[PDB]
Amino acid sequence: DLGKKLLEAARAGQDDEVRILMANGADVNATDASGLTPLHLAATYGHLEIVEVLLKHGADVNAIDIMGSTPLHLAALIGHLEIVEVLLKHGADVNAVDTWGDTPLHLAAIMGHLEIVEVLLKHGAD
Amino acid sequence: REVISIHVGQGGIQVGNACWELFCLEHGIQPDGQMPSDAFNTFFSETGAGKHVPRAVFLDLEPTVIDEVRTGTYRQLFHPEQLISGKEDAANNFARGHYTIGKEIVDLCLDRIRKLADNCTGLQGFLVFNSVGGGTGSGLGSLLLERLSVDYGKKSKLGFTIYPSPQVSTAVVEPYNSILSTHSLLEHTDVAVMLDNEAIYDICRRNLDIERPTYTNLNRLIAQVISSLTASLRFDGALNVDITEFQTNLVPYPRIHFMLSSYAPIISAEKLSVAEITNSAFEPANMMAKCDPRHGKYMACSMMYRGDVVPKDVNASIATIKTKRTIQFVDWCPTGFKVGINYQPPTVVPGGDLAKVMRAVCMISNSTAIAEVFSRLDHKFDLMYAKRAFVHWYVGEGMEEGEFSEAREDLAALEKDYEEVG
Amino acid sequence: MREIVHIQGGQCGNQIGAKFWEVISDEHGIDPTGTYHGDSDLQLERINVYYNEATGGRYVPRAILMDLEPGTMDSVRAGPFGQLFRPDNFVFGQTGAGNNWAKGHYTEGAELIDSVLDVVRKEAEGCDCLQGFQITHSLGGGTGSGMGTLLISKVREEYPDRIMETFSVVPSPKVSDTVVEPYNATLSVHQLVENADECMVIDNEALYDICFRTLKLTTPTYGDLNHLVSAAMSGVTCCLRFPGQLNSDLRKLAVNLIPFPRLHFFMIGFAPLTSRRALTVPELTQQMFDAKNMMCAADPRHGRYLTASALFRGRMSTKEVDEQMLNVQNKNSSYFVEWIPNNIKSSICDIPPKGLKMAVTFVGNSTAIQEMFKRVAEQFTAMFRRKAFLHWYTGEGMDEMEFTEAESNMNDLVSEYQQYQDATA
Ligand SMILES: Nc1nc2c(ncn2[C@@H]2O[C@H](COP(=O)(O)OP(=O)(O)OP(=O)(O)O)[C@@H](O)[C@H]2O)c(=O)[nH]1
Ligand SMILES: Nc1nc2c(ncn2[C@@H]2O[C@H](COP(=O)(O)OP(=O)(O)OP(=O)(O)O)[C@@H](O)[C@H]2O)c(=O)[nH]1
Ligand SMILES: [Mg+2]
Ligand SMILES: [Mg+2]
């Protein structure tokens, strides 16, 4: 199943495997059992180039998993600055709230990612 | 009629260091055991080579304090078999001294005590020196009391027992050890003399004008009291001549046997009459336990004078004190007031703090006022025990938690006992 | 009670450990060849507590050096006193643990633990009377954290009657922005609650704040942080290393500080704080209590002390210490529980630390430390709810339920601090 192979290559940072799967018809917006997408997984594990290629090919920047987590939540939690900015550039919802009541700003603050906090605030985080 | 002294833990050993220093000076014994120039044989054996040896053991669960004896001024005075030390101490934990650590050395302690008793024509009893606030004197001391009650069933035991003060305290659990010890002393001593560090420290600070006193300062004062109280054991006298007479003269009810003592005059070596020192002996400022004996009643009082003291002058001072009526005895009590005079004045210790005096008095009494000392420690105990603070340290070293409430209840009963007598 | 066996594990463990040995060897007059030079006989009276005596008359740290990576120990070997450590007490792998508490506790660390235990046993069995063990490590990495707690568990089993003490470095994003560190530290705190008697907390959040705000260092290097750590460690251990009576060994220290066995994490304050005129006694007593002087990023005025000890060092008056200790207890009466009588005690050690004539170390058991555990717990919970990097741990064979068990044990610790904080007499 190409969707699940794409999920796993996005999670693992296998750039060439992503490009090959996408070129053979892989579903850019495939979901795993909890609703995580390839963009969610690359944002979490820090793979900037895969994040950008997915966004250039129809990835939903504001997809939520079953817990309401957006890719921007995960990038701000883990501390990937350049990914936070790319997601914002492509219309990520800066004030998305997950099922725990957290925003990306709250997660970045908790984890002490101060530059990300400042970027989120400049983009209107509440 | 020999008497064997048992010194347990730091406080007991260092008070013993001061007592034996004074005993040697009073009997003219040098640290060598030699005597250039019977009664003093109650406290010393004698060897074929003319050595006079204390009838004593020093017992500790760590070697630091014992090593200082083994290597100090009196290294020649004791046989090495008399000086027993463990490797790791009780860590201020009654349970460690009584159970897990003390159990490994008590037989060795009882064998050395048995060697002393085997050299006694007619052993009459034991003096047991310890503090209650630590773990070794309290816990191993109480365990030794239990075993001595079984092995020497017919022999009297008199405690010289150090109670704690915030001013010279290194352990928050002191009230626990104090109550557990006092429960042991209630059952396994016939008499116990309360050496309350709170009062003794204050006497050194005030009467002796020592700004922050050392244990040596406190201990040299204690030794003068203990020497006065044991004067009739070691010399010819007529009041408290054997250990058993302490109980008969001072204890009307078996478990009410904790004694308040005093000394007069307590004056520094920088720069009084029979009547004056007799008044001073009834003053809080001269009491070795922190209480007001004017607020209580006396079951018993023994006054032991030393030195240039005429019997008629004692009788006159006591007559006057009786009329003043502040000092009250329990009506119809089967014990009461007794007086004794030894005509030798107290001995001066080189480098001591106490001024040379031609007469002195030491009182030992059974007063209800002593309940104040127990009441303060019981209250501290109660605050901590209500949260079971620190209790796990004792339960983990072989004590059942039930022994806490058993001891506390014993102390509650003793407090009610004093209240009813009042 | 005499000898202590020291083990330093991982990068943090070995760096703060090396500084400890430098600082106390100077205090004791020991040079890098192990030869004593000094005046006071107080320096050698309890030298056996941390040092073995060799044939040569030289003194050798009773120290084991452990890591899954050879790097930091190689630089320890090259450091000032590196040639004084027993060469056969270096136990190192080649792999590393990759900041993964599982690699340290269950896989790479598990493959090396027998070689560590071999050396530890050899030192322990050679002691006249062993007091216990001292472990220096970070809780946020993989080796010091995961393999350190494995070692604590194994030694606890073989030596259940001896005292287990740690100097544990708590992580902070201010110092290392590495997001699995809350996992590693929560897993370790779980271990520490069950298997250690005494934990001397060293909070990188607090060290960072001290270096930034009070010492005005804009970007604090590990050297800057460790300058504070070594000052605290010398001051905390002074009572074990020099003649005295208060807290004079690990077991007596424990009996004074720990009313409830799980609550064995201590807040340490010290004064003066220094970078790499003497203070008066009123200044020492005020500063030692101040949030700005604590090694734990918890505000002592947000909780109550169960117990505490103030260990003064230098030529100062007993009278004046008594006077000021009465003053600070009166002024801070709201921050001590009322149901433990005389729960604050003090002592004076005549030997001051290097470059100072007056100093103090305040060691306390305060319910305020719950603030530090709550900080780590919030980060743990943020990561764990999104299951970020969890496969790194279950991939080494660890069960996810261990995450929930540790999280719950540390949450119960916080609950218990709050119970005694609100208790009344
Ligand atoms: N009066 C007097 N009290 C002492 C002396 N030494 C210790 N104490 C008191 O004894 C209590 C402390 O117990 P220690 O006797 O030192 O303890 P220990 O029996 O050696 O038991 P561990 O050390 O816990 O094994 C406190 O109340 C001290 O003030 C002393 O020389 N004279
Ligand atoms: N105060 C202080 N913290 C340190 C030091 N070195 C590392 N740390 C902190 O310790 C944590 C990382 O743990 P390390 O000691 O480096 O890791 P390790 O134990 O060597 O484990 P692995 O490298 O994963 O095998 C982070 O929180 C760092 O900030 C140090 O010298 N001083
Ligand atoms: Mg002792
Ligand atoms: Mg490392």
Residue numbers in the entry:
A (entry chain F): 13 to 138
B (entry chain A): 2 to 38, 47 to 280, 286 to 436
C (entry chain B): 1 to 42, 45 to 278, 284 to 360, 369 to 440
Original authors' sentences:
Recent advances in the structural characterization of tubulin– and MT–agent complexes have led to the identification of six distinct drug‐binding sites in mammalian tubulin (reviewed in Steinmetz and Prota (2018)). These observations imply that fine structural differences in the architecture of drug‐binding sites between protozoan and mammalian tubulin could be exploited to develop novel parasite‐specific anti‐tubulin drugs. In this work, we provide a structural description of apicomplexan tubulin drug‐binding sites together with the comparison to their mammalian counterparts and use this information to rationally design a parasite‐specific tubulin inhibitor dubbed “parabulin”.
We solved the structures of T. thermophila αβ‐tubulin in complex with DARPin1 (D1; (Pecqueur et al, 2012)) at 1.75 Å resolution and paclitaxel‐stabilized T. thermophila MTs at 3.3 Å resolution. Based on structural modeling, we observed that rings A and B of CA4 could be similarly accommodated in the T. thermophila tubulin structure.
